[PDB]
Amino acid sequence: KTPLAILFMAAVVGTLVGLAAVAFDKGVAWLQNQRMGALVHTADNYPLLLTVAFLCSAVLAMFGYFLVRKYAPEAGGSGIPEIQGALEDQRPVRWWRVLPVKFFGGLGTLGGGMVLGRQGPTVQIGGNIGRMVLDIFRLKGDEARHTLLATGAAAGLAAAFNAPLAGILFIIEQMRPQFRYTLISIKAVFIGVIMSTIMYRIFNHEVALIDVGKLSDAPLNTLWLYLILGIIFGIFGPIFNKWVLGMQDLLHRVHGGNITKWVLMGGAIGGLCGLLGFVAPATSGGGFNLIPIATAGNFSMGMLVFIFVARVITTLLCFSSGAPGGIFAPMLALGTVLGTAFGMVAVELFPQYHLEAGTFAIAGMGALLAASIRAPLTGIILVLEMTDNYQLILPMIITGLGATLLAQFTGGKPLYSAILARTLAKQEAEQLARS
Amino acid sequence: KTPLAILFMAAVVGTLVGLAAVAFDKGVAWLQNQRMGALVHTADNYPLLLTVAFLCSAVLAMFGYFLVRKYAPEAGGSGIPEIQGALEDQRPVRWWRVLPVKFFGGLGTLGGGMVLGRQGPTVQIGGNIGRMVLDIFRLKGDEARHTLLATGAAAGLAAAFNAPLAGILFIIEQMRPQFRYTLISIKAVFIGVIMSTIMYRIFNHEVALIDVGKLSDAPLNTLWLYLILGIIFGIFGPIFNKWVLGMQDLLHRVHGGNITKWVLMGGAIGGLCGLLGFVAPATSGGGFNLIPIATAGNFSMGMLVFIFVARVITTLLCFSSGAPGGIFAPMLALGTVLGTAFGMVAVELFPQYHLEAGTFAIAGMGALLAASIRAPLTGIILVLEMTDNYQLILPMIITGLGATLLAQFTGGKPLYSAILARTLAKQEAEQLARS
Ligand SMILES: [Cl-]
Ligand SMILES: [Cl-]
Ligand SMILES: [Cl-]
Ligand SMILES: [Cl-]
Ligand SMILES: [Cl-]
Ligand SMILES: [Cl-]
């Protein structure tokens, strides 16, 4: 009866999520190209070019910050904490607000060149799309409601980075405590992921989404260095997480919850990233365009330290303000830069081992996700499906374990669970409306 | 306190399992080469060559069947149903019997050229190794006992086919209902898999374990054919499973549980496979040497039908008798042959689509595991780590879903769960010893 209705709806959800993820992607790419086109007007007067670049990114940012604070407060930030909450029945899915705001707000913020990524946006959009078709078709039952939320979210992740294996792992690993695993619920996840992936492939050439060439394999006597890399990320992960929650509390003292001040602060952050797009490209943007540049070895050791410091600052400023945008693609840039640096050192320390810094760059992306988000297998596979370097499978599991151990040992928690816990706590507290 | 003891013991288990898996592998390869060497004596008198080939495989088979029926009845068959049972507290782990019998019995049966594979042997050996070091070190606690069983089993699977990603998926997907997922229990699985994989790599060149070259990718307008392939395997999977349980009941009427008759029947089965090694190579052996031959397109359509029929017969005869040996590698051969046949038809039916039979061969391996064993993600990844054809990720998820749907719809169950259910049922029944 209703089990076959669920499996057919999953296919509908997967197709619609897929087209939304491609629209979001193509929309953000067009806006960035439109900005570079409107600045050809001031081709050889650099002062005025930087000034209108600033105001152009400030307006789009202010547009996004406005939509979130006015129509959908829960569309601020990543999206994953909110979906995670909804899979527990702890949070609503207001798709009539979150789909228009997250889409058109995320176009303004990522489109302006802010230090934000697509994962959280499209995963939340996918989940709301999943709830939308449930509410449109009037499917009744607690299983259907929960199941289509899950297939919508997985489909969002798979369509965003062309990563179907990762979209399934996002539900069976990262959302293990929330997800009610049944025979029908897991087939629906597969169907939604299959359909959303086909929609990506119709519009994009199937390739390495992060073209980093084909690196060398990792020899046996080399493998221990990936455990040391993992340990380093293990201690750094929980510190970074303390900084993104701290920076939410600190940036709140600026505006005090007031819409006008909040939007103006977003315009400054948005404007600044739009400026830094031009004067120092590697310090700004989501992170994708600089990962292959860094992994190839084009930066000096001193330059990698500068990008790392600058990026941690612009990453925290963008994400913690509560702009609609994810921290996934920023974190990949941070792990690439720190991993390449680690790689450079090891190359000079051990001339015997026949090493290459780029293998440690790719391990670094997996390591930072493992240490902060604490869903290792999902991050490791995500990075492999985007780089297509499947011979680094063992190195990355070793780095992921390193990161996972020391992150638990040094008192870290999963970033997304921590943010949801603060949202739930703050909501309980504001039942002082109840005296 | 005890959490750090568990993570250090996992490393010990992973190393020991790794060396046992390599020893088993190298032992089985040496015996097969020793048999081909002792038959050079009768190089140009073919009648006597086949006769001693028969008696040579019959003795080794009789040796294996003897060890199982005399010292460790639960070492007969795969191993996975028994481990699965132990993870539920429903079955004992008699490592003082199962390690010597499974190892030296599995050397005689797989070494004689019987239609049996290494997965079940090494997974059960790994689990017993995990319980052995728990009992040696006298670790107390229900968590430790359960956890090291799990890391031992995963490590066995990862070391047997050089498949670390698959060894983790074997516990988080295939053993989901049994496995008590905690922060410490999952890190221990990782550690055991890391260490066992290193032990494989020390003794074997890291390559494609099934060298099948680099096939073409799957174009978009082609993807629907993999769903039809999946559907076909979906209906065939539960039928095959009915035949392996049926063939256990039928082959039991031969000996009636009597040790003498049982061993003699094993010698006939063992002898026959040793003969068929020489007169018709593709009808016998575990399956690994004929998968690349079939995938390359060297067999005519008529020959693929003959191998399929012959193999289903020799696969059921070998496995269902209760010889120590797995059905995993046999099933891969069956899915390769049926998939190549399907591939050939589609190539001629659609000259427009620019297809290759070999893509459907690899999809077929995933499809038969999905339809019988019913752990799709684990099988699909296993096949990718052995063939190294990571561009067929989406085709295989589509075939796995096809297979998983129709196998549930047509009333199939997971092979391993079905065998364990019959073992538990038969044990309850023989408490008629209680009047
Ligand atoms: Cl957030
Ligand atoms: Cl993101
Ligand atoms: Cl995110
Ligand atoms: Cl069995
Ligand atoms: Cl096997
Ligand atoms: Cl098996």
Author numbering:
A (entry chain A), B (entry chain A): 30 to 464
Text taken from the publication that reported this structure:
Here, to obtain a high-resolution structure of the H+-bound conformational state, we crystallized a triple mutant, ‘QQQ’, in which glutamines replace three glutamates: Gluex, Gluin, and E113. The QQQ mutant (E148Q/E203Q/E113Q) was crystallized in the lipidic cubic phase, without any antibody Fab fragment. The structure, determined at 2.6 Å resolution, reveals an unanticipated change in the conformation of the mutated Gluex residue, Q148 (Glnex). Instead of occupying the ‘up’ position, as seen in the structure of the E148Q protein, the sidechain has moved away from the permeation pathway and into the hydrophobic core of the protein, a conformation we designate as ‘out’. However, our new structure reveals that small adjustments in residues 186, 190, 199, and 357 suffice to accommodate Glnex occupancy in the hydrophobic core. In QQQ, this intracellular constriction is unchanged compared to WT CLC-ec1 and is narrower than that observed in the CLC-1 channel. Strikingly, Glnin moves into the hydrophobic core of the protein, to within 6 Å of Glnex. Analogous simulation of the QQQ mutant revealed a dramatic and unanticipated result: water penetration into the hydrophobic core of the protein is greatly increased, and water pathways directly connect bulk water in the intracellular solution to Glnex, without requiring intermediate connection to Glnin. Taken together, the DEER distance distributions provide strong support for the conclusion that the QQQ structure represents a WT CLC-ec1 conformation.
CLC transporter proteins are present in intracellular compartments throughout our bodies – in our hearts, brains, kidneys, livers, muscles, and guts – where they catalyze coupled exchange of chloride (Cl–) for protons (H+). CLC-ec1 is a prokaryotic homolog that has served as a paradigm for the family. Like all CLC proteins, CLC-ec1 is a homodimer in which each subunit contains an independent anion-permeation pathway. Gluex is positioned at the extracellular entryway to the Cl–-permeation pathway, where it acts both as a ‘gate’ for the transport of Cl– and as a participant in the transport of H+.
